[PDB]
Amino acid sequence: AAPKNRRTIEVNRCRRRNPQKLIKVKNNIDVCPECGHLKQKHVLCAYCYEKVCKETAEIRRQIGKQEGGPFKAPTIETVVLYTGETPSEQDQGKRIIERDRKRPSWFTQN
Template sequence: MATSLLRIFHAAFQNVEIRLLQAFGLHPPPGPALAIPGCHHPLQGSQGSDMTEPSGLSSLLGGVFLMAAPKHRQSLERRHKRQRHPDKLIKPKENLFPCPECGSMMQEGFLCINCYQRIKYETDIIRQKIKETETDGLASTAETVVRYADETITESDKSKRVIEMARKKPHWFTKDMYDEHWKTS
């Protein structure tokens, strides 16, 4: 209680000092300053007039954010026990099985990374072919169909933009791959 009253009186005297210096046209000399927690410099407007200050606990703290700090140092043994608890360690994967396409090990419910790399490579090639067929750098609004060397164009695909690939279609890249995706979503 006494320290809070001391801080309030200190802030009041500081305000009086600042106003007197401003009234005589003097400013406080530049130099080192003593900062007391809970006391703050009054806000000044553009003409030098003071703005109203909030009262109560918020004015005493002056926007200070207090955080908890430990009272005693924690030993390395206790810290390591907490950090290296068996529940926090990485557990070995038990749901691994070979990929039906490439045979590499993959986790159940996830896409095989080797198969993903192959699909990404194939779709990058298709995107490059699509960019080559674009005129004036503008994308076409027509639906696009990819035709490999071993495929034929159907009647429904004749009205669409056809991207021709000069190589054989990969065995994992099925035609209904996109159709199944659109049916489920």
């Protein structure tokens, strides 16, 4: 099937600029109480989630240097340790990961 006539710009504007086609404004945007950047109420903050991934990647790189190869997953718990810290009373018999960096403020030691 081919068009019988050419549709005018007046007809096209009513279709292209219809409110259904137009972008809907979002009302679920608020500022992150931690860093102040924008975020959605149902989505984790991008800035806050990014700094967690950067630290998580560093931790996982340390784990790879200790196992020294695949198929060497430990059968014990794991503990992340920073500069100026020692293993705790409850962190006994676990695999400690030493980090040459100060413990982040948002990272709460447990």
